[PDB]
Amino acid sequence: KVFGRCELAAAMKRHGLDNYRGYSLGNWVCAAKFESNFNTQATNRNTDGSTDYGILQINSRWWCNDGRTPGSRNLCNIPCSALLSSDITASVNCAKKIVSDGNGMNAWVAWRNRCKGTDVQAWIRGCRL
């Protein structure tokens, strides 16, 4: 499923991401835009052999199991395929664990390089949340 900008903002708010760990909704929408362009089915292979899954491109190296990432962990205790659902519950729940890992949203390289320090409020502007 490819979410509309405001539709995803609303879904993320309902799932508890608004200001989670201090990150306003705009940060999460911005991250999702550049990681997956709001497409829940996005998958991308990483240089280390792991793979990124879903709207927030969560990696198999540490967070989910895809059965093909040697030496990896499954800290969110979920099959990576669960992160591709039209229902973002799995991705959000795992994102909450990732953002709490210590480095905040810097865990998402795209957020650091394309959202951090910018006007992220623009991503939820006009949305009736």
Ligand SMILES: [Cl-]
């Ligand atoms: Cl980047």
Ligand SMILES: [Zn+2]
């Ligand atoms: Zn829209």
Ligand SMILES: [Zn+2]
């Ligand atoms: Zn939902």
Ligand SMILES: [Zn+2]
């Ligand atoms: Zn990635």
